[PDB]
Structures are given as structure tokens and as C-alpha cells.
Write a protein that binds this ligand. Sequence first.
Ligand code: NA
Length: 163
Amino acid sequence: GSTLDGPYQPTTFNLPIDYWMLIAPTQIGRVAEGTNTTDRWFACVLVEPNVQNTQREYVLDGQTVQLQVSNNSSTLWKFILFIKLEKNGAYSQYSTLSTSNKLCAWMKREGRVYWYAGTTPNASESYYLTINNDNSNVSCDAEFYLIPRSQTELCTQYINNGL
Ligand code: NA
């Protein structure tokens, strides 16, 4: 089998730059979130297949919020990436990952958070938001793995084909 660094237990930590955090939830709902403390609070949530347009509640940055979600695939899971831009603001949707594998991943580099988006087996790190704070903490509700940038090809492989 594949050999990855992890699984690590759910925790909050200063994710080092240049490592993919490959997150492996077992439950739908909130998966992980992070912030630069100033103008970016980002979060990903997991939505099961075959979900008609609806408002669900998630506790993001400690607050219970209602967000509109949907997943019109009968087979693929869907991670949704939400971001709010000020402490007291509302979250908007920025990216998605439709997947048969239920894994998502992001990396802090170049002042940005890169995120795997698209539809497996052809998801890629095509989306990023800007944080400009290398000490931005991430809080993860799921087990996760860390993959150095030298093995980005492996992260891509795991996202798209499973471990
Ligand atoms: Na949809």
C-alpha cells in the first residue's frame, strides 16, 4: 500500500508551509477550518451524494451559521470551500471538490492556501485564496496526513484514486 505521514488525530496547529494537509473525514459536515486572524476565515464542509438545494447549519469560527448547499451527483461526495473576509462577516462559497474518495487537501505556500478542486479522478490544485500569514492555524475535525511538496504528485494520486 501507499505510505503517508499520518494519520494524525484531529487537532489545531500551525500547519507548516509547503505541506499538503490531506484530510480524511468519516462524517459529513464541518471538516476543517483555518484563519489568518485578520481577513480570512476559511472552512471546508462535506456533503453526501444526492442532496437537493437546502440550508444546513455549521459551526464556523465558533458561530452557528446557515449555508446553502447542494450535491446533484448520485454517486460523488462534495467538499465545499467557504470563506469569510472579516470577523463579523458572512461566508461565501469559493470552490468545490466532487469526489469518489472523500479526501480533500490544502497547502500553505506563497502567501496562499492552495486547494484541490474539480471532479475526481481529475481534481487538481487549481484554486487558491490569499492569506499572507505563514503562521495561520488550521483546526481539523478529521484525521489527516501531511505530504511534502516534493510528493505533490502523490497527493494528486491520493485525492483522485484514494490512498
Ligand atoms: Na449541486
